[PDB]
Amino acid sequence: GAMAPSYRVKRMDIAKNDEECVVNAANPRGLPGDGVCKAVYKKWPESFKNSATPVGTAKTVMCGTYPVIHAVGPNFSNYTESEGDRELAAAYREVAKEVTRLGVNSVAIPLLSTGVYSGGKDRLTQSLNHLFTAMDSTDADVVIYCRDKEWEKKISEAIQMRT
Ligand SMILES: Cc1cc(C)c2c(=O)[nH]n(C)c2n1
Ligand SMILES: [Cl-]
Ligand SMILES: [Cl-]
Ligand SMILES: [Cl-]
């Protein structure tokens, strides 16, 4: 575990992370997809061997010895708010299990279901809180990656408000 487990946020490509493993915002079919998923596919294509996994689950595949945790958030275009909320919480719980199992001291994580799976809604708070609920009991350093400047400020504020 990390000596003083922390949360941090960076505004940059998660494919350039400085952590011991990465969480992919995957599709259920293990397809290269778009957004975070496509950047992960370009950086760690080997990790997409038998990466397909259901909504609300996480499946880890090694690129060399570097773990890629394929976490499948719900597409809120397809799910009800209620069911999508449940699956989004579940995907993060499965990430917490994988991070623990791997014995990593740090993990790079995007906000699941906040991009093309958001159903055209701002889910920063919903997704971040489910991330916290899952990861708070882990001792890995968590580094959240985002691309939007205002999202960076809002994530940084939400982290600092609990410290
Ligand atoms: C909306 C979005 C798109 C891309 C391409 C990335 C990325 O490479 N890292 N993050 C968190 C991203 N978020
Ligand atoms: Cl970048
Ligand atoms: Cl997404
Ligand atoms: Cl973002």
Side-chain angles (χ1 to χ4, degrees), residues 53-97:
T53 195
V55 169
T57 74
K59 181 162 199 189
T60 300
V61 181
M62 308 299 283
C63 176
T65 74
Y66 188 80
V68 178
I69 305 170
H70 298 277
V72 185
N75 179 5
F76 280 95
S77 302
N78 296 336
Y79 283 90
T80 68
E81 289 292 331
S82 173
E83 203 69 358
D85 188 66
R86 188 187 52 69
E87 293 293 5
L88 178 58
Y92 282 116
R93 290 191 298 274
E94 299 302 309
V95 165
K97 295 182 196 173

mmCIF file of all heavy atoms in Angstrom, residues 53-97:
data_model
loop_
_atom_site.group_PDB
_atom_site.id
_atom_site.type_symbol
_atom_site.label_atom_id
_atom_site.label_comp_id
_atom_site.label_asym_id
_atom_site.label_seq_id
_atom_site.Cartn_x
_atom_site.Cartn_y
_atom_site.Cartn_z
ATOM 1 N N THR A 53 -16.203 -7.960 -21.178
ATOM 2 C CA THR A 53 -16.732 -8.223 -19.817
ATOM 3 C C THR A 53 -18.048 -7.458 -19.691
ATOM 4 O O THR A 53 -18.213 -6.430 -20.343
ATOM 5 C CB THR A 53 -15.667 -7.853 -18.780
ATOM 6 O OG1 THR A 53 -16.053 -8.425 -17.536
ATOM 7 C CG2 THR A 53 -15.492 -6.351 -18.662
ATOM 8 N N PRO A 54 -19.014 -7.924 -18.867
ATOM 9 C CA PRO A 54 -20.328 -7.290 -18.799
ATOM 10 C C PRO A 54 -20.317 -5.898 -18.163
ATOM 11 O O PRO A 54 -19.371 -5.554 -17.434
ATOM 12 C CB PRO A 54 -21.165 -8.239 -17.928
ATOM 13 C CG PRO A 54 -20.417 -9.546 -17.978
ATOM 14 C CD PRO A 54 -18.961 -9.162 -18.076
ATOM 15 N N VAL A 55 -21.408 -5.167 -18.384
ATOM 16 C CA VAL A 55 -21.624 -3.854 -17.718
ATOM 17 C C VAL A 55 -21.555 -4.083 -16.194
ATOM 18 O O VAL A 55 -22.026 -5.133 -15.698
ATOM 19 C CB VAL A 55 -22.935 -3.193 -18.164
ATOM 20 C CG1 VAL A 55 -23.239 -1.999 -17.266
ATOM 21 C CG2 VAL A 55 -22.867 -2.794 -19.648
ATOM 22 N N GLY A 56 -20.913 -3.164 -15.474
ATOM 23 C CA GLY A 56 -20.818 -3.245 -14.011
ATOM 24 C C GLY A 56 -19.714 -4.153 -13.495
ATOM 25 O O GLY A 56 -19.705 -4.444 -12.303
ATOM 26 N N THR A 57 -18.808 -4.592 -14.374
ATOM 27 C CA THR A 57 -17.673 -5.481 -14.021
ATOM 28 C C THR A 57 -16.345 -4.851 -14.426
ATOM 29 O O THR A 57 -16.358 -3.828 -15.136
ATOM 30 C CB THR A 57 -17.819 -6.880 -14.635
ATOM 31 O OG1 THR A 57 -17.546 -6.844 -16.041
ATOM 32 C CG2 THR A 57 -19.190 -7.469 -14.375
ATOM 33 N N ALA A 58 -15.249 -5.455 -13.956
ATOM 34 C CA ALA A 58 -13.881 -5.049 -14.305
ATOM 35 C C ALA A 58 -13.104 -6.323 -14.589
ATOM 36 O O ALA A 58 -13.319 -7.338 -13.920
ATOM 37 C CB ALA A 58 -13.271 -4.182 -13.241
ATOM 38 N N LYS A 59 -12.336 -6.299 -15.648
ATOM 39 C CA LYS A 59 -11.529 -7.461 -16.042
ATOM 40 C C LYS A 59 -10.142 -6.916 -16.284
ATOM 41 O O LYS A 59 -10.030 -6.054 -17.156
ATOM 42 C CB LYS A 59 -12.112 -8.106 -17.288
ATOM 43 C CG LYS A 59 -11.346 -9.327 -17.758
ATOM 44 C CD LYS A 59 -12.167 -10.160 -18.695
ATOM 45 C CE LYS A 59 -11.620 -11.562 -18.803
ATOM 46 N NZ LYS A 59 -12.285 -12.322 -19.890
ATOM 47 N N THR A 60 -9.139 -7.479 -15.620
ATOM 48 C CA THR A 60 -7.746 -7.018 -15.782
ATOM 49 C C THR A 60 -7.050 -7.889 -16.817
ATOM 50 O O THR A 60 -7.190 -9.101 -16.750
ATOM 51 C CB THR A 60 -6.988 -7.068 -14.459
ATOM 52 O OG1 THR A 60 -7.701 -6.207 -13.557
ATOM 53 C CG2 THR A 60 -5.566 -6.615 -14.676
ATOM 54 N N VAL A 61 -6.309 -7.264 -17.716
ATOM 55 C CA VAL A 61 -5.446 -7.967 -18.700
ATOM 56 C C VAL A 61 -4.116 -7.246 -18.656
ATOM 57 O O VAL A 61 -4.080 -6.031 -18.670
ATOM 58 C CB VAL A 61 -6.035 -7.977 -20.119
ATOM 59 C CG1 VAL A 61 -5.125 -8.728 -21.087
ATOM 60 C CG2 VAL A 61 -7.446 -8.539 -20.118
ATOM 61 N N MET A 62 -3.027 -8.008 -18.619
ATOM 62 C CA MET A 62 -1.650 -7.467 -18.483
ATOM 63 C C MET A 62 -1.137 -7.068 -19.869
ATOM 64 O O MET A 62 -1.324 -7.866 -20.809
ATOM 65 C CB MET A 62 -0.715 -8.511 -17.871
ATOM 66 C CG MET A 62 -1.237 -9.117 -16.585
ATOM 67 S SD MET A 62 -1.469 -7.862 -15.297
ATOM 68 C CE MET A 62 0.232 -7.628 -14.799
ATOM 69 N N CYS A 63 -0.533 -5.878 -19.979
ATOM 70 C CA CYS A 63 0.250 -5.460 -21.153
ATOM 71 C C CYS A 63 1.697 -5.566 -20.673
ATOM 72 O O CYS A 63 2.133 -4.715 -19.852
ATOM 73 C CB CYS A 63 -0.101 -4.059 -21.608
ATOM 74 S SG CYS A 63 0.929 -3.507 -22.981
ATOM 75 N N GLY A 64 2.408 -6.633 -21.031
ATOM 76 C CA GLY A 64 3.683 -6.929 -20.354
ATOM 77 C C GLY A 64 3.404 -7.298 -18.918
ATOM 78 O O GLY A 64 2.690 -8.275 -18.675
ATOM 79 N N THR A 65 3.924 -6.517 -17.968
ATOM 80 C CA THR A 65 3.611 -6.642 -16.519
ATOM 81 C C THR A 65 2.791 -5.444 -16.045
ATOM 82 O O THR A 65 2.650 -5.304 -14.820
ATOM 83 C CB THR A 65 4.857 -6.722 -15.626
ATOM 84 O OG1 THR A 65 5.448 -5.424 -15.538
ATOM 85 C CG2 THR A 65 5.870 -7.728 -16.122
ATOM 86 N N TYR A 66 2.313 -4.603 -16.963
ATOM 87 C CA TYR A 66 1.535 -3.389 -16.597
ATOM 88 C C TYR A 66 0.060 -3.768 -16.626
ATOM 89 O O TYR A 66 -0.446 -4.074 -17.703
ATOM 90 C CB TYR A 66 1.843 -2.242 -17.548
ATOM 91 C CG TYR A 66 1.228 -0.929 -17.111
ATOM 92 C CD1 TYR A 66 1.818 -0.164 -16.125
ATOM 93 C CD2 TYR A 66 0.032 -0.479 -17.640
ATOM 94 C CE1 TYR A 66 1.241 1.016 -15.673
ATOM 95 C CE2 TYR A 66 -0.545 0.713 -17.227
ATOM 96 C CZ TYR A 66 0.043 1.453 -16.215
ATOM 97 O OH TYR A 66 -0.494 2.657 -15.827
ATOM 98 N N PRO A 67 -0.690 -3.696 -15.501
ATOM 99 C CA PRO A 67 -2.108 -4.084 -15.499
ATOM 100 C C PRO A 67 -3.048 -3.021 -16.067
ATOM 101 O O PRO A 67 -2.911 -1.849 -15.720
ATOM 102 C CB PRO A 67 -2.447 -4.377 -14.026
ATOM 103 C CG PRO A 67 -1.129 -4.296 -13.287
ATOM 104 C CD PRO A 67 -0.211 -3.438 -14.147
ATOM 105 N N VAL A 68 -3.933 -3.451 -16.981
ATOM 106 C CA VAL A 68 -5.023 -2.620 -17.556
ATOM 107 C C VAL A 68 -6.309 -3.214 -16.997
ATOM 108 O O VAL A 68 -6.662 -4.351 -17.314
ATOM 109 C CB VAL A 68 -4.997 -2.558 -19.090
ATOM 110 C CG1 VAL A 68 -6.160 -1.723 -19.630
ATOM 111 C CG2 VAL A 68 -3.664 -2.050 -19.646
ATOM 112 N N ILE A 69 -7.009 -2.448 -16.167
ATOM 113 C CA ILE A 69 -8.267 -2.881 -15.513
ATOM 114 C C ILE A 69 -9.390 -2.320 -16.400
ATOM 115 O O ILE A 69 -9.638 -1.118 -16.380
ATOM 116 C CB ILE A 69 -8.362 -2.382 -14.062
ATOM 117 C CG1 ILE A 69 -7.147 -2.796 -13.210
ATOM 118 C CG2 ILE A 69 -9.667 -2.851 -13.466
ATOM 119 C CD1 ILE A 69 -7.084 -2.131 -11.866
ATOM 120 N N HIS A 70 -10.002 -3.184 -17.210
ATOM 121 C CA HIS A 70 -11.106 -2.808 -18.124
ATOM 122 C C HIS A 70 -12.369 -2.694 -17.290
ATOM 123 O O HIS A 70 -12.908 -3.732 -16.907
ATOM 124 C CB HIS A 70 -11.222 -3.813 -19.281
ATOM 125 C CG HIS A 70 -9.997 -3.848 -20.123
ATOM 126 N ND1 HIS A 70 -9.778 -2.940 -21.133
ATOM 127 C CD2 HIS A 70 -8.933 -4.672 -20.100
ATOM 128 C CE1 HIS A 70 -8.628 -3.227 -21.717
ATOM 129 N NE2 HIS A 70 -8.092 -4.280 -21.115
ATOM 130 N N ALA A 71 -12.774 -1.488 -16.939
ATOM 131 C CA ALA A 71 -14.007 -1.282 -16.135
ATOM 132 C C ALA A 71 -15.157 -0.799 -17.033
ATOM 133 O O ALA A 71 -14.992 0.213 -17.734
ATOM 134 C CB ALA A 71 -13.761 -0.301 -15.020
ATOM 135 N N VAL A 72 -16.247 -1.558 -17.080
ATOM 136 C CA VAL A 72 -17.394 -1.266 -17.987
ATOM 137 C C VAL A 72 -18.523 -0.556 -17.229
ATOM 138 O O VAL A 72 -19.338 -1.171 -16.527
ATOM 139 C CB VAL A 72 -17.869 -2.541 -18.692
ATOM 140 C CG1 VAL A 72 -18.951 -2.212 -19.707
ATOM 141 C CG2 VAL A 72 -16.686 -3.189 -19.391
ATOM 142 N N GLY A 73 -18.531 0.758 -17.333
ATOM 143 C CA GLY A 73 -19.653 1.565 -16.833
ATOM 144 C C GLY A 73 -20.864 1.389 -17.735
ATOM 145 O O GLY A 73 -20.757 1.047 -18.914
ATOM 146 N N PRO A 74 -22.055 1.688 -17.210
ATOM 147 C CA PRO A 74 -23.249 1.688 -18.040
ATOM 148 C C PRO A 74 -23.309 2.856 -19.038
ATOM 149 O O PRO A 74 -22.879 3.987 -18.751
ATOM 150 C CB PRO A 74 -24.364 1.828 -17.025
ATOM 151 C CG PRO A 74 -23.720 2.630 -15.884
ATOM 152 C CD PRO A 74 -22.298 2.095 -15.812
ATOM 153 N N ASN A 75 -23.896 2.590 -20.199
ATOM 154 C CA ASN A 75 -24.263 3.683 -21.148
ATOM 155 C C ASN A 75 -25.649 4.186 -20.743
ATOM 156 O O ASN A 75 -26.665 3.457 -20.861
ATOM 157 C CB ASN A 75 -24.215 3.208 -22.595
ATOM 158 C CG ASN A 75 -24.612 4.276 -23.592
ATOM 159 O OD1 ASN A 75 -24.851 5.444 -23.214
ATOM 160 N ND2 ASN A 75 -24.657 3.873 -24.861
ATOM 161 N N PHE A 76 -25.715 5.376 -20.191
ATOM 162 C CA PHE A 76 -26.985 5.955 -19.701
ATOM 163 C C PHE A 76 -27.945 6.283 -20.872
ATOM 164 O O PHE A 76 -29.071 6.636 -20.581
ATOM 165 C CB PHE A 76 -26.687 7.187 -18.844
ATOM 166 C CG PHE A 76 -26.273 6.826 -17.444
ATOM 167 C CD1 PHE A 76 -24.937 6.720 -17.097
ATOM 168 C CD2 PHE A 76 -27.214 6.579 -16.477
ATOM 169 C CE1 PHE A 76 -24.562 6.377 -15.807
ATOM 170 C CE2 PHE A 76 -26.840 6.229 -15.181
ATOM 171 C CZ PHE A 76 -25.514 6.152 -14.847
ATOM 172 N N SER A 77 -27.548 6.128 -22.131
ATOM 173 C CA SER A 77 -28.513 6.149 -23.266
ATOM 174 C C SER A 77 -29.428 4.920 -23.179
ATOM 175 O O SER A 77 -30.597 5.000 -23.629
ATOM 176 C CB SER A 77 -27.808 6.253 -24.576
ATOM 177 O OG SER A 77 -27.000 7.424 -24.606
ATOM 178 N N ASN A 78 -28.920 3.821 -22.606
ATOM 179 C CA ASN A 78 -29.586 2.501 -22.646
ATOM 180 C C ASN A 78 -30.222 2.171 -21.315
ATOM 181 O O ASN A 78 -31.216 1.438 -21.340
ATOM 182 C CB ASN A 78 -28.629 1.396 -23.073
ATOM 183 C CG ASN A 78 -28.134 1.602 -24.483
ATOM 184 O OD1 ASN A 78 -28.806 2.267 -25.270
ATOM 185 N ND2 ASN A 78 -26.967 1.081 -24.776
ATOM 186 N N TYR A 79 -29.598 2.581 -20.203
ATOM 187 C CA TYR A 79 -30.051 2.233 -18.831
ATOM 188 C C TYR A 79 -30.998 3.330 -18.324
ATOM 189 O O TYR A 79 -30.837 4.505 -18.682
ATOM 190 C CB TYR A 79 -28.850 2.035 -17.892
ATOM 191 C CG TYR A 79 -28.139 0.722 -18.061
ATOM 192 C CD1 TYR A 79 -27.081 0.581 -18.939
ATOM 193 C CD2 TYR A 79 -28.530 -0.396 -17.340
ATOM 194 C CE1 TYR A 79 -26.490 -0.656 -19.149
ATOM 195 C CE2 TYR A 79 -27.916 -1.626 -17.521
ATOM 196 C CZ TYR A 79 -26.868 -1.751 -18.407
ATOM 197 O OH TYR A 79 -26.260 -2.958 -18.608
ATOM 198 N N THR A 80 -31.946 2.966 -17.472
ATOM 199 C CA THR A 80 -32.681 3.950 -16.624
ATOM 200 C C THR A 80 -31.674 4.608 -15.665
ATOM 201 O O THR A 80 -30.626 3.976 -15.338
ATOM 202 C CB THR A 80 -33.810 3.270 -15.855
ATOM 203 O OG1 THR A 80 -33.238 2.390 -14.888
ATOM 204 C CG2 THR A 80 -34.766 2.538 -16.774
ATOM 205 N N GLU A 81 -31.953 5.818 -15.192
ATOM 206 C CA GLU A 81 -31.084 6.483 -14.178
ATOM 207 C C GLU A 81 -30.846 5.546 -12.993
ATOM 208 O O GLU A 81 -29.718 5.424 -12.537
ATOM 209 C CB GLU A 81 -31.727 7.778 -13.686
ATOM 210 C CG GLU A 81 -31.724 8.870 -14.728
ATOM 211 C CD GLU A 81 -30.334 9.401 -15.050
ATOM 212 O OE1 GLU A 81 -29.467 9.360 -14.150
ATOM 213 O OE2 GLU A 81 -30.121 9.857 -16.185
ATOM 214 N N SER A 82 -31.878 4.868 -12.527
ATOM 215 C CA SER A 82 -31.814 3.958 -11.367
ATOM 216 C C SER A 82 -30.843 2.791 -11.639
ATOM 217 O O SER A 82 -29.962 2.501 -10.803
ATOM 218 C CB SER A 82 -33.188 3.454 -11.090
ATOM 219 O OG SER A 82 -33.115 2.483 -10.096
ATOM 220 N N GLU A 83 -31.041 2.102 -12.752
ATOM 221 C CA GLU A 83 -30.269 0.882 -13.073
ATOM 222 C C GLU A 83 -28.838 1.284 -13.429
ATOM 223 O O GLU A 83 -27.892 0.574 -13.024
ATOM 224 C CB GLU A 83 -30.951 0.118 -14.197
ATOM 225 C CG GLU A 83 -30.571 -1.342 -14.204
ATOM 226 C CD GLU A 83 -31.105 -2.161 -13.049
ATOM 227 O OE1 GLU A 83 -31.766 -1.602 -12.162
ATOM 228 O OE2 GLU A 83 -30.805 -3.348 -13.026
ATOM 229 N N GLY A 84 -28.691 2.385 -14.140
ATOM 230 C CA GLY A 84 -27.376 2.877 -14.552
ATOM 231 C C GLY A 84 -26.584 3.276 -13.321
ATOM 232 O O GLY A 84 -25.396 2.967 -13.231
ATOM 233 N N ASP A 85 -27.238 3.951 -12.384
ATOM 234 C CA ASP A 85 -26.611 4.312 -11.100
ATOM 235 C C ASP A 85 -26.060 3.050 -10.415
ATOM 236 O O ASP A 85 -24.898 3.059 -9.957
ATOM 237 C CB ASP A 85 -27.579 5.068 -10.189
ATOM 238 C CG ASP A 85 -26.843 5.592 -8.975
ATOM 239 O OD1 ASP A 85 -25.960 6.477 -9.154
ATOM 240 O OD2 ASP A 85 -27.145 5.121 -7.884
ATOM 241 N N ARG A 86 -26.864 1.986 -10.362
ATOM 242 C CA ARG A 86 -26.492 0.702 -9.715
ATOM 243 C C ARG A 86 -25.260 0.109 -10.422
ATOM 244 O O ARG A 86 -24.295 -0.282 -9.719
ATOM 245 C CB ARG A 86 -27.680 -0.264 -9.741
ATOM 246 C CG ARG A 86 -27.469 -1.536 -8.934
ATOM 247 C CD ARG A 86 -28.582 -2.560 -9.106
ATOM 248 N NE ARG A 86 -28.862 -2.873 -10.504
ATOM 249 C CZ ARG A 86 -28.041 -3.529 -11.323
ATOM 250 N NH1 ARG A 86 -26.861 -3.956 -10.904
ATOM 251 N NH2 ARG A 86 -28.398 -3.749 -12.576
ATOM 252 N N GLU A 87 -25.283 0.055 -11.756
ATOM 253 C CA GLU A 87 -24.177 -0.555 -12.539
ATOM 254 C C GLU A 87 -22.920 0.301 -12.398
ATOM 255 O O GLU A 87 -21.836 -0.274 -12.426
ATOM 256 C CB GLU A 87 -24.584 -0.767 -13.996
ATOM 257 C CG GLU A 87 -25.672 -1.822 -14.140
ATOM 258 C CD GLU A 87 -25.256 -3.239 -13.796
ATOM 259 O OE1 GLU A 87 -24.111 -3.442 -13.342
ATOM 260 O OE2 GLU A 87 -26.068 -4.156 -13.982
ATOM 261 N N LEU A 88 -23.056 1.623 -12.309
ATOM 262 C CA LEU A 88 -21.890 2.520 -12.232
ATOM 263 C C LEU A 88 -21.208 2.315 -10.864
ATOM 264 O O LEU A 88 -19.984 2.165 -10.804
ATOM 265 C CB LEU A 88 -22.353 3.959 -12.435
ATOM 266 C CG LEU A 88 -21.252 5.010 -12.342
ATOM 267 C CD1 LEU A 88 -20.149 4.767 -13.353
ATOM 268 C CD2 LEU A 88 -21.856 6.393 -12.513
ATOM 269 N N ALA A 89 -21.988 2.224 -9.793
ATOM 270 C CA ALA A 89 -21.466 1.900 -8.449
ATOM 271 C C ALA A 89 -20.759 0.542 -8.496
ATOM 272 O O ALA A 89 -19.678 0.430 -7.941
ATOM 273 C CB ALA A 89 -22.581 1.895 -7.437
ATOM 274 N N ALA A 90 -21.357 -0.447 -9.157
ATOM 275 C CA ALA A 90 -20.813 -1.812 -9.200
ATOM 276 C C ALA A 90 -19.467 -1.800 -9.944
ATOM 277 O O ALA A 90 -18.544 -2.475 -9.511
ATOM 278 C CB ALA A 90 -21.791 -2.754 -9.850
ATOM 279 N N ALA A 91 -19.398 -1.161 -11.107
ATOM 280 C CA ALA A 91 -18.140 -1.164 -11.880
ATOM 281 C C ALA A 91 -17.010 -0.673 -10.951
ATOM 282 O O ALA A 91 -15.944 -1.274 -10.903
ATOM 283 C CB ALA A 91 -18.287 -0.294 -13.096
ATOM 284 N N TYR A 92 -17.219 0.426 -10.224
ATOM 285 C CA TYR A 92 -16.162 0.926 -9.317
ATOM 286 C C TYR A 92 -15.833 -0.067 -8.204
ATOM 287 O O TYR A 92 -14.658 -0.183 -7.835
ATOM 288 C CB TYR A 92 -16.552 2.285 -8.736
ATOM 289 C CG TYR A 92 -16.363 3.456 -9.661
ATOM 290 C CD1 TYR A 92 -17.449 4.208 -10.090
ATOM 291 C CD2 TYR A 92 -15.110 3.846 -10.062
ATOM 292 C CE1 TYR A 92 -17.296 5.328 -10.898
ATOM 293 C CE2 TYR A 92 -14.937 4.966 -10.859
ATOM 294 C CZ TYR A 92 -16.031 5.708 -11.279
ATOM 295 O OH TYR A 92 -15.834 6.831 -12.013
ATOM 296 N N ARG A 93 -16.815 -0.746 -7.614
ATOM 297 C CA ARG A 93 -16.525 -1.757 -6.566
ATOM 298 C C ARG A 93 -15.609 -2.828 -7.166
ATOM 299 O O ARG A 93 -14.696 -3.266 -6.452
ATOM 300 C CB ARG A 93 -17.794 -2.397 -6.006
ATOM 301 C CG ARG A 93 -18.641 -1.477 -5.153
ATOM 302 C CD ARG A 93 -19.731 -2.258 -4.419
ATOM 303 N NE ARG A 93 -20.712 -2.943 -5.257
ATOM 304 C CZ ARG A 93 -21.819 -2.380 -5.754
ATOM 305 N NH1 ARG A 93 -22.090 -1.109 -5.531
ATOM 306 N NH2 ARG A 93 -22.658 -3.103 -6.464
ATOM 307 N N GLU A 94 -15.839 -3.217 -8.436
ATOM 308 C CA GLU A 94 -15.029 -4.269 -9.114
ATOM 309 C C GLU A 94 -13.639 -3.706 -9.366
ATOM 310 O O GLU A 94 -12.686 -4.442 -9.207
ATOM 311 C CB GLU A 94 -15.740 -4.832 -10.358
ATOM 312 C CG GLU A 94 -17.074 -5.480 -10.033
ATOM 313 C CD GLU A 94 -16.960 -6.619 -9.038
ATOM 314 O OE1 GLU A 94 -16.108 -7.510 -9.289
ATOM 315 O OE2 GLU A 94 -17.675 -6.594 -7.972
ATOM 316 N N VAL A 95 -13.497 -2.418 -9.673
ATOM 317 C CA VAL A 95 -12.158 -1.806 -9.769
ATOM 318 C C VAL A 95 -11.432 -1.917 -8.416
ATOM 319 O O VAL A 95 -10.282 -2.278 -8.444
ATOM 320 C CB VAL A 95 -12.251 -0.357 -10.269
ATOM 321 C CG1 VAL A 95 -10.966 0.421 -10.054
ATOM 322 C CG2 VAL A 95 -12.684 -0.325 -11.715
ATOM 323 N N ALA A 96 -12.049 -1.564 -7.299
ATOM 324 C CA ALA A 96 -11.446 -1.646 -5.948
ATOM 325 C C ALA A 96 -10.926 -3.057 -5.661
ATOM 326 O O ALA A 96 -9.776 -3.175 -5.225
ATOM 327 C CB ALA A 96 -12.429 -1.191 -4.915
ATOM 328 N N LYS A 97 -11.692 -4.083 -6.016
ATOM 329 C CA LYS A 97 -11.291 -5.496 -5.846
ATOM 330 C C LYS A 97 -10.034 -5.763 -6.670
ATOM 331 O O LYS A 97 -9.141 -6.417 -6.134
ATOM 332 C CB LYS A 97 -12.406 -6.469 -6.224
ATOM 333 C CG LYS A 97 -13.634 -6.397 -5.328
ATOM 334 C CD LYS A 97 -14.728 -7.407 -5.676
ATOM 335 C CE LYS A 97 -16.058 -7.043 -5.029
ATOM 336 N NZ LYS A 97 -17.141 -7.929 -5.517
#
